[PDB]
Design a protein around this nucleic acid. Structure first.
Lengths: 59, 59
DNA sequence: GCTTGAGGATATCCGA
DNA sequence: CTCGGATATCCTCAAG
């Protein structure tokens, strides 16, 4: 099994990230708890969030 | 097997990527091929280059 | 049909 | 068990 990130899951994810105060303050366990998605592990979120954090470079 | 990216090995990589017009134009075959380090695959090099091309790491 | 390489997405590993 | 980071594997789509 290899998951992939439909756009609706991505939006749910980014809503969770935003509720936790941004990509930098959010952590996987939080994002997962908020998303409430079946068949989804902390590792799915961990990897996806690492990708998300590397779209913006802050000084 | 798991590689481990030394800092001066990373230098050689940067050196090479710069010989090839930077992170965007540079290619894994090309830069592996320019680095001439032994015990170094194309696969090591593409994973590293993917990390370097991101908006976070390219400066 | 092989055998490659490319970019991007996703998973697995390391050390704290 | 969690986190952040580093590194490898997978997929799709090419080329030769």
């Amino acid at each position: 099994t290899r998951m992939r990130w439909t756009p609706e899951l991505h939006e749910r994810f980014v809503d969770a990230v935003n509720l936790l105060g941004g990509s930098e303050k959010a952590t996987p366990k939080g994002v997962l708890k908020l998303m409430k998605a079946d068949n989804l592990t902390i590792y799915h979120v961990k990897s996806h969030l690492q990708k998300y954090r590397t779209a913006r470079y802050r000084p």
